[PDB]
Design a protein around this ligand. Structure first.
Ligand SMILES: Cc1cc2nc3c(=O)[nH]c(=O)nc-3n(C[C@H](O)[C@H](O)[C@H](O)COP(=O)(O)OP(=O)(O)OC[C@H]3O[C@@H](n4cnc5c(N)ncnc54)[C@H](O)[C@@H]3O)c2cc1C
Length: 453
């Protein structure tokens, strides 16, 4: 176990009680460095290890599609942890008041949590640190290389972060040891009841069409840690060979579809890299997939970690902020509201079809996501309004929303983060421009539109 994967958030006196794992971002039993580190510390202290998940009050800022996917994965996760003699306690309320109360009530000795660069995660840490007296650690179980170890500053481009990540691969890209069960079973409600009351409070704000029927289709992605492995095996055996040539074709389902499992942490990205690296397929397709799940994925955590205002206009590069400021007073072709973008009532059938896929499946195609966000910038009153509309529609209907990948992706499409300066156009400026005629020459837009009516 590499000691570089774990950071110390707060020092203090260690108690004689069970080591608590505050699971937030990585909801899985296998390939969880934070869970493995908690077990190792528990073994050395001759005490059991426990897992504590907090059902925060911000679940109403999302939809049922993200609430059911996460909770139904925990129901399978609770059974798996119980088979390892590891109890799980699901708390409802503020993490600042629930974690600090659980530590005091159960005489916790050491508190461990997974790493997350999001602002909401840092808000909870500030509350938890102020109310605990036991050692506090955090472990990066999401990225293959720890976020603080890949780079010590903000990487403005992928070609500068790629050499730093690949050079650290021989040290951190390794196999996961078996999660040892607890020696004995140690000494706040049913998840089924939490899902029933949670959905009931989310029914009035459910996405529906004119016929009062739901828009979301839950049969596309089955939640759970077992289902994530089945999808990963399907991609390597069926879609990995043609991934490098059909990644930019929205009409073909040639993607891995691992993001909803990678977002909630139901499957480890390092596990996906290990299986792909030992798989024999097209070298140009493996390189394309490795560049997306390692470079572009972990650079999204580098963006949110080394930029506090990652969701603001100030995190954009200097060239993009000056170019957008020089085209603020340009007459936009169209100005749509948030309700018009949400309902897909624009003049672009390609953009509307992209939005419908977001509403129905909850996972828009990787290529169309770049087009869907750049048209928001072109059809908004200001770049600040484009950021809010893109972030809102992303975190609300994307099954992988509220993730550093989304914020880095939105900042790339609107502010050109991790991008270069292109030809200077009106309104958009030097930000990379994507046209409807450009997509027609790239893929069959007629089939993509006709699929999502
Ligand atoms: C405007 C916009 C919004 C986005 N919204 C989200 C979002 O809400 N949540 C989210 O997790 N990702 C988001 N992304 C990144 C990307 O679109 C998705 O991660 C990708 O579509 C995931 O689906 P997939 O696994 O089938 O694609 P794949 O090509 O099979 O990629 C597999 C994994 O590689 C990573 N990856 C691939 N492409 C990217 C990328 N462009 N940026 C970062 N990581 C990547 C992801 O971890 C992904 O799960 C967004 C990108 C843009 C441009």
């Amino acid at each position: 176990m590499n000691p570089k994967r774990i950071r110390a958030l707060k020092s203090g006196k260690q108690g004689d009680g069970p080591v608590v794992y505050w699971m937030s971002r990585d909801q899985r039993a296998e390939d969880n460095w934070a869970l493995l580190f908690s077990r190792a510390i528990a073994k050395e202290a001759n005490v059991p290890v426990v897992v504590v998940f907090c059902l925060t009050d911000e679940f109403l800022e999302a939809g049922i599609r993200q609430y059911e996917f996460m909770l139904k994965g925990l129901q399978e996760l609770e059974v798996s942890l119980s088979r390892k003699k590891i109890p799980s306690f699901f708390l409802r309320g503020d993490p600042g008041e629930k974690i600090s109360r659980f530590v005091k009530d159960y005489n916790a000795g050491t508190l461990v949590t997974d790493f997350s660069p999001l602002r909401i995660k840092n808000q909870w840490i500030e509350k938890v640190i102020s109310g605990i007296s036991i050692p506090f650690f955090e472990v990066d179980a999401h990225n293959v290389v720890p976020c603080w170890e890949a780079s010590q500053k903000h990487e403005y481009a992928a070609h500068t972060f790629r050499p730093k990540l690949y050079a650290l691969l021989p040290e951190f890209l390794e196999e996961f040891p078996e999660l040892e069960p607890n020696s004995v079973t140690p000494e706040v409600e049913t998840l089924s009841d939490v899902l029933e009351t949670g959905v009931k409070a989310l029914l009035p704000e459910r996405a529906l069409l004119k016929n009062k029927d739901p828009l979301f289709e839950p049969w596309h992605f089955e939640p759970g840690e077992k289902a994530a492995k089945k999808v990963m095996e399907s991609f390597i055996a069926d879609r990995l060979d043609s991934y490098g040539a059909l990644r930019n074709d929205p009409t073909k389902n040639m993607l891995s579809n691992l993001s909803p499992y990678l977002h909630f942490g139901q499957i480890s990205s390092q596990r996906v890299v290990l299986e792909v690296e030992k798989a024999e397929s097209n070298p140009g397709s493996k390189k394309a997939f490795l560049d997306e799940i390692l470079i572009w994925k972990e650079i999204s955590d580098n963006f949110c970690y080394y930029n506090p205002g990652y969701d603001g206009f100030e995190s954009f590069p200097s060239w993009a902020k000056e170019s957008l400021n020089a085209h603020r007073n340009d007459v936009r072709s169209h100005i749509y509201t948030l309700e018009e973008f949400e309902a897909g009532k624009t003049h672009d059938p390609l953009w509307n079809a992209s939005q419908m896929e977001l509403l129905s499946t909850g996972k828009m195609h990787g290529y169309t996501r770049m087009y869907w966000a750049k048209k928001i910038l072109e059809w908004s009153e200001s770049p600040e309004k484009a950021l809010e509309i893109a972030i809102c529609l992303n975190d609300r209907y994307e099954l992988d929303g509220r993730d550093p990948n989304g914020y880095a992706g939105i900042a790339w499409s609107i502010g050109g983060v991790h991008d270069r300066a292109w030809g200077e156009r009106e309104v958009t400026g030097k930000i990379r421009y994507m046209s409807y005629e450009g997509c027609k020459r790239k893929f069959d837009v007629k089939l993509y539109i006709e699929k999502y009516s």
